[PDB]
């Protein structure tokens, strides 16, 4: 009935569960300044808020993929997003173009998944 | 069974509700100008949408927020945001750059909630 | 309790289920080089993925519109997806800039429906 929260703060929680769903926080990278170890940092961020919400990789539902710059980086987040997920379990995603909120990130991506 | 709607026109409905979930429309500002008075307008539609629709801020599951100019207005959509909230309610969110369907628009977000 | 996949590659499933719920990717432009011909065909191949998972144009919960050049091609968008919408049935819905993963591609959208 009610909406449980995972790491709040005063703008945001990481994770919001209600029900059957899990939704996330667009998630950021750590320290990585390449598009390769952001990409990683991001996935790596995203798959422990899953465990800690009751969900895993496979019971993704979507992934919108934001890239400061499509062009360049389209092809490193491919190589390293097809690397993370589960073999034949892929989400439904979208990938655009949008400066995130620093310029030195390169890669941000939005989760929403399924409870276990 | 059936999704119900609010605020209809050709294009779009103010929100969309189907079960306990609420959908609303990206909501722009009304007649603000400037940064800080175009964030509480849109929070204040977004609102009266989760009034019309059953639910309430503490309900709210996830916002992406859309700014023209994330460079620049970033920490002045955080201050009005952060009061706008719930206290220690906040809900998932993704902050990113895009123009809106007008050049004078800086912000936009849209909402999914649950139903009260 | 399983979200079952349509049309699963390596990087993504055109549509993933879960209970109620229709999650589609982003779908993009067929061969057409220009805003109406494109927006049509993205249309068309959600309105082909929506049959595929039990749902259909009247069930739609939300879409998120992205355009590489808003300021010039929302007038077209609005005309094409008008059309195509059912009578007095639209879905919740928002419309920004984004560039898209190749330079030739001026829409793409990103759906949300509810299974019938």
Same mark, same amino acid.
């Given at each position: 009935?009610?909406? /449980?929260? &995972?790491?709040?703060?005063? =703008?945001?929680?990481?994770?919001?569960?209600?029900? @059957?769903?899990?939704?996330?926080? #667009? $998630?950021?990278? #750590? $320290?990585?300044?390449?598009?390769? #170890?952001?990409?990683?940092?991001?996935?790596? +961020? &995203?798959?422990?808020?899953? @465990?800690?919400?009751?969900? =895993? +990789?496979? =019971? &993704?539902?979507?992934?919108?993929?934001?890239? +400061?710059?499509?062009?360049?980086?389209?092809?490193?987040?491919?190589? %390293?997003w /097809?690397?993370?997920?589960?073999? #034949?379990?892929?989400?439904?995603?979208? *990938?655009? $173009?949008?400066?995130?909120?620093?310029?030195? %990130?390169?890669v941000? &991506? *939005?989760?929403?998944?399924?409870?276990?």
């Amino acid at each position: 009935m009610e909406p /449980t929260r &995972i790491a709040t703060n005063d =703008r945001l929680s990481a994770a919001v569960c209600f029900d @059957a769903l899990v939704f996330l926080s #667009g $998630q950021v990278p #750590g $320290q990585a300044e390449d598009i390769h #170890g952001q990409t990683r940092e991001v996935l790596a +961020k &995203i798959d422990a808020l899953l @465990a800690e919400a009751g969900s =895993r +990789k496979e =019971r &993704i539902l979507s992934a919108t993929i934001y890239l +400061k710059d499509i062009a360049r980086d389209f092809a490193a987040l491919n190589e %390293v997003w /097809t690397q993370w997920l589960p073999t #034949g379990q892929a989400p439904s995603r979208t *990938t655009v $173009q949008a400066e995130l909120a620093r310029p030195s %990130v390169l890669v941000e &991506i *939005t989760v929403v998944a399924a409870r276990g």
